[PDB]
Design a binder for this molecule. Structure first.
Ligand SMILES: Nc1ncnc2c1ncn2[C@@H]1O[C@H](COP(=O)(O)OP(=O)(O)O)[C@@H](O)[C@H]1O
Ligand SMILES: Nc1ncnc2c1ncn2[C@@H]1O[C@H](COP(=O)(O)OP(=O)(O)O)[C@@H](O)[C@H]1O
Lengths: 494, 104, 485
């Protein structure tokens, strides 16, 4: 029946949260999304949940479209904003049944959000510098943990960080914008996974095009061409005329994507060009942009300096193979990482782990302003706002206090999703952050995260679990705005 | 029903037959582009016109259809207040003061 | 709410698994399928039972999907997979009620699976390939108990001749193998013994007028999807072919007599109305390449294909006998007989033995079946669990306890008591050091497994265990189902 649409809306919020409450966190349980046609899907992230979750109540529609807005804005955090919004709604409904007129609640929530964002922009961590490597390597190892490579995982975590630092490509705005496809996968056989090492350039496994091409070339002009070099029955037969003509222009090292040629031996000896087939298209585009050149199909008649650069192309025995070590291009983009062992089928999970470590490291590198993850931010915000509510002193004390208490539901759900006792863990987090403010000498106790491996309070800046400042700021702002909008809606009776 | 409004705004004369159809028979605009907002709705943005005579448009957004209607009602309330300022030139203090004053 | 959906999921899994629990082994109890039309169905295959039956619970639907995939992936054992999954979920029910998170349970299951994968290879007996004596023993052991009992000779010779005709040496030593690129030619007529094996691809389509040199000493097949017309006023394809001078050309449409003479001038044999399901194996056996852009045309367009072509007419059918082609990767196995009522199942068992041989190349290992391997791995897990500590040890023992369901069912569906036999098998298996005793399926009597002589490929049993464990973790990782109905 219902006695107040406030109650009905907060029940809708509680339901829509409880549906997606469990899936938050890397240890979240998957959800079983059945449809009318029976084509069911399985997912563990809230964005994929709410994009196809069948909603019926208008409050639920509002909450889910705020969630979609947050996802389109910053990406991660949909689960967190939905959970925080639902917690705020239910706490504010209890407080309005405590005979508080909702506009005071809205004002208190807005003031609390302003104070929270100002606090976060004041007590964040600026470790995302060149001095920060131990935290970064620790984060890579922790995200890389629970695998058979943990013996040698230290070297992988040490090479990935300075590789992505080196392969970092600046943009037109003078900021680091690492392209993920720049680091290319590479298989290897023979030696096991513990013998892998970092290579500063892409190395394609193919047949030996020629032997007259030296390791280091002072001047290289990549006249990349798709067509093969063969004699058939500006040239009718694409073997000599265009190659020599562009040699006159200055094409020294030509990366011919086409097939091999019978008389190409002398031309490669005198010029220093290579003919490699079966080149992966993404790798070909990357080496095109790494060498600062476009893809040329034919050469019918620009050629002055647009041709790509391959300064050093080592022609030696690498993993008992003659890999074409095309590196030192004009733009520092072409590089690859070896994956040893026997083959790619068993180490495919190792490949995905390396990919995700690369992704998390490069996301940490961007958004130079960063905050500790794992619920430390929420605990610090709760401690701040509990004091700020009493300091402010107007009639929004209860509103700000319940906003502070509602922020500690994220550590609770992370704790319960990690099979650990939720209340005990959040209480430990709260007590640890009490010393951050009460004790002025305990300044460096502000990043006690949640080590989900054991579910124990732990330093997290050293651990390295990081969240972009913009992500948390926008998440909190959107959650507060959604709470204000829902609380501002009561013009029904049911 | 929106044909008359569109013709009034962007200055397009109506075209019923292909016999007298020309470019100047229509109304040109500076830019006409479609954008995606949050990936859940496509709104065309024909931004700028040669002669946008007495017309503005605001993409009124909000949590739901109904609060969007609320924003529209607020905008039209402001427009009507401005119109009342135009028609009648007499101003009073508000915020409940006139009501209590006149009650006394 | 909460764990209640998990209990419902595992209850659905248990109630769908036990439907066909009793229908595996050499003495499977038979089942009824009663459609609501008065009909009555005779069926033993549990896979057929689940395909015929329909259920509404989505978890059961996912289990049907995994059973079908396992059927279409490695072969038999689907009933064993379903039984193992059902038993593991049923035994995990108790731990779910124990107020422990599914995360610790699934972690314990993962560790148990990792242990089982190793201990299977520990106990697997080595086998040899192409060794006619005990390969034929395996044929009489496992490839039997089908409808090939009186005709095992044809199946065995067909398998042994066709093991070395789809091998792919892509990244290793013939470890890549497929059962689809083989040319199975299933046509009735004559005696069943007329079936043979050929090194090449056969086409049931042939030109209407084979009064011409259809066979050349070195055919150079090139795939072409275009149909030749009378002339340009397209004839240009004829000169384009003449440029590279091949001798065989494949097209999917008919060729006119005038166009046939034009292609004779082009020095190529035109083949019409070919099928894509046959054109793919044509290209595989001949290494053909297709290209039509004049700029891209080069010396690589036309390559050597067959080695000795010929066409015969057996059973008033326009055959096409390509033999001794370049690549023995898509060869021919002939299938003749008076009737085809069993030969389809014969070739299914042939592909089963083909997977057996392929995995023997992968891992030359046989596991002692008849509950011997199951009891061995259960004993290994139970003895290894003594050192294990923490709450996760209980699932690590319950998975082993629930894995003994296969010998339990084998003993149950033969009349013998399922308790005394199991207790005797377990008690003697532990004190035995390296015996791996396996219960006889027919008499339901304990017997040393070497004497009985039954075995399974390591790969198929490994896949069954992996699929069962992954199904268990998938069904335990579901926290809620509400998305509508
Ligand atoms: N290694 C980790 N340890 C602890 N918490 C983590 C770790 N990685 C991510 N998190 C937590 O996951 C939360 C965000 O995940 P989530 O919002 O579910 O992603 P999405 O928005 O894509 O669903 C963050 O609050 C962060 O604290
Ligand atoms: N002669 C036999 N004695 C004991 N067990 C047997 C015998 N023949 C088959 N089995 C058992 O049958 C099982 C295989 O049946 P299964 O693969 O489930 O058939 P399907 O997959 O066609 O349903 C094996 O585990 C094996 O132990």
């Amino acid at each position: 029946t219902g006695e107040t649409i406030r109650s009905q809306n907060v029940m809708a919020a509680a339901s829509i949260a409880n549906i997606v409450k469990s899936s938050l966190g890397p240890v979240g349980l998957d959800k079983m999304l059945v449809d009318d046609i029976g084509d069911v899907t399985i997912t563990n992230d809230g964005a994929t949940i709410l994009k196809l979750l069948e909603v019926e109540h208008p409050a639920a529609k509002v909450l889910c479209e705020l969630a979609d807005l947050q996802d389109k804005e910053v990406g991660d955090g949909t689960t967190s904003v939905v959970i925080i919004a639902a917690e705020l709604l239910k706490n504010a409904d209890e407080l309005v049944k405590q005979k508080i007129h909702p506009t005071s609640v809205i004002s208190g929530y807005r003031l609390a959000c302003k104070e929270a964002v100002r606090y976060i922009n004041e007590n964040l961590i600026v470790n995302t510098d060149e001095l920060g490597r131990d935290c970064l390597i620790n984060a890579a190892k922790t995200s890389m943990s629970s695998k058979i490579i943990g013996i040698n995982g230290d070297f992988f975590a040490n090479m990935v960080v300075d590789a992505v630092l080196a392969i970092k490509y600046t943009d037109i705005r003078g900021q680091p914008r690492y392209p993920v496809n720049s680091v290319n996968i590479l298989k290897a056989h023979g030696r096991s996974q513990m013998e892998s090492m970092l290579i500063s350039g892409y190395a394609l496994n193919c047949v030996v095009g020629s032997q007259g091409m030296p390791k280091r070339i002072v001047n290289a002009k990549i006249a990349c061409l798709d067509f093969s070099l063969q004699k058939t029955k500006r040239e009718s037969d694409i073997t000599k005329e265009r190659i020599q003509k562009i040699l006159a222009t200055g094409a020294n090292v030509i990366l011919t994507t086409g097939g091999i040629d019978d008389m190409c031996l002398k031309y490669f000896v005198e010029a220093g060009a290579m003919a490699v087939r079966r080149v992966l298209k993404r790798d070909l585009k990357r080496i095109a942009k790494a060498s600062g050149a476009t893809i040329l199909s034919t050469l019918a008649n620009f050629e002055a300096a647009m041709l790509g650069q391959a300064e050093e192309v080592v022609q030696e025995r690498i993993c008992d193979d003659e890999l074409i070590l095309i590196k030192n291009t004009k733009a520092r983009t072409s590089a690859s990482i070896i994956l040893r062992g026997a083959n790619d089928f068993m180490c495919d999970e190792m490949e995905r782990s390396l990919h995700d470590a690369l992704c998390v490291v490069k996301r940490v590198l961007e958004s130079k302003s960063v905050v500790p993850g794992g619920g430390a931010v929420e605990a610090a915000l709760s401690i701040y706002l509990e004091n700020y509510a009493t300091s402010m002193g107007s009639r929004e004390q209860l509103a700000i206090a319940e906003f502070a208490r509602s922020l500690l539901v994220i550590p609770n759900t992370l704790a319960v999703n990690a099979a650990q006792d939720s209340t005990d863990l959040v209480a430990k987090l709260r007590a640890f952050h009490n010393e951050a403010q009460v004790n002025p000498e305990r300044k460096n106790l502000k990043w006690i995260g949640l080590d989900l491996s054991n579910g124990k309070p732990r330093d997290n800046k050293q651990a390295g679990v990081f969240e972009p400042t913009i992500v948390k700021v926008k998440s909190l702002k959107f959650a507060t705005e959604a709470a204000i909008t829902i609380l501002r809606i009561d013009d029904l009776i049911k | 029903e929106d044909i008359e409004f569109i013709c009034k705004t962007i200055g397009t004369k109506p075209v019923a037959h292909i016999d007298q159809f020309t470019a100047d028979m229509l109304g040109s605009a500076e830019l006409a582009e479609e954008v995606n907002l949050n990936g859940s709705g496509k709104l065309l943005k024909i931004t700028g016109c040669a002669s946008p005579g007495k017309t503005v448009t605001i993409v009124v957004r909000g949590s739901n259809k109904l609060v969007i209607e609320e924003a529209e009602r607020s905008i039209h309330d402001a427009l009507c207040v401005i119109r009342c300022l135009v028609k009648k030139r007499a101003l009073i203090a508000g915020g409940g003061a006139p009501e209590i004053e006149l009650a006394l | 709410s909460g764990r209640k959906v998990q209990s419902g999921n595992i209850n659905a899994a248990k109630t769908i698994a036990d439907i066909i629990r009793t229908c595996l082994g050499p003495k499977s109890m038979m089942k009824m399928l009663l459609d609501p039309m008065g009909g009555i169905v005779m069926t033993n295959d549990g896979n057929a039972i689940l395909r015929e039956i329909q259920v509404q619970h989505p978890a059961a639907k996912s289990m049907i999907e995994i059973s079908r995939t396992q059927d279409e992936e490695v072969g038999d054992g689907t009933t064993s997979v379903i039984i193992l999954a059902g038993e593991m979920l049923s035994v995990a029910e108790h731990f779910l009620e124990q107020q422990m998170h599914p995360t610790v349970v699934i972690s314990a299951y993962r560790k148990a699976l990792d242990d089982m994968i190793s201990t299977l290879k520990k106990i697997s007996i080595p086998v040899d390939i192409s060794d006619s004596d005990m390969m034929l023993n395996i044929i009489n052991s496992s490839i039997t108990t089908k409808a090939i009992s009186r005709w095992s000779s044809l199946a065995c010779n067909i398998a042994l001749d066709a093991v070395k005709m789809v091998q792919f040496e892509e990244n290793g030593r013939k470890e890549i193998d497929i059962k689809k690129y083989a040319r199975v030619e299933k046509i009735p007529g004559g005696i069943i013994e007329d079936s043979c094996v050929l090194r090449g691809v056969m086409i049931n389509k042939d030109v209407t007028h084979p009064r011409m040199r259809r066979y050349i000493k070195n055919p150079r097949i090139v795939l072409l999807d275009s149909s030749l017309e009378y002339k340009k006023g397209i004839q240009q394809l004829c000169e384009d072919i003449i440029q590279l001078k091949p001798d065989v050309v494949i097209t999917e449409k008919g060729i006119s007599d005038l166009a046939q003479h034009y292609l004779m001038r082009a020095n190529i044999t035109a083949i019409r109305r070919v099928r894509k399901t046959d054109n793919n194996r044509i290209a595989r056996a001949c290494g053909a390449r297709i290209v039509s852009r004049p700029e891209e045309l080069r010396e690589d367009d036309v390559g050597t294909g067959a080695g000795l072509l010929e066409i015969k007419k057996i059973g008033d059918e326009y055959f096409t006998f390509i033999t001794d082609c370049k690549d023995p990767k898509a060869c021919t196995i002939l299938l003749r007989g008076a009737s085809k009522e069993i030969l389809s199942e014969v070739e299914r068992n042939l592909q089963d033995a083909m997977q057996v041989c392929r995995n023997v190349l992968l891992d030359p290992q046989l596991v002692p079946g008849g509950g011997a391997s199951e009891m061995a791995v259960a004993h290994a897990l139970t003895e290894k669990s003594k050192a294990m500590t923490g709450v996760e040890q209980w699932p690590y023992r319950a998975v082993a306890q629930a894995l003994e369901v296969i010998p339990r069912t084998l003993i149950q569906n033969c009349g013998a008591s399922t308790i005394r036999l199991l207790t005797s098998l377990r008690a003697k298996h532990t004190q035995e050091n390296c015996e791996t005793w396996g219960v006889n399926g027919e008499t339901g009597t304990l017997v040393d497994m070497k004497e009985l002589g039954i075995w399974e490929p390591l790969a198929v049993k490994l896949q069954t265990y992996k699929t069962a464990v992954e199904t268990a973790v998938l069904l335990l990782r579901i926290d809620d189902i509400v998305s509508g109905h």
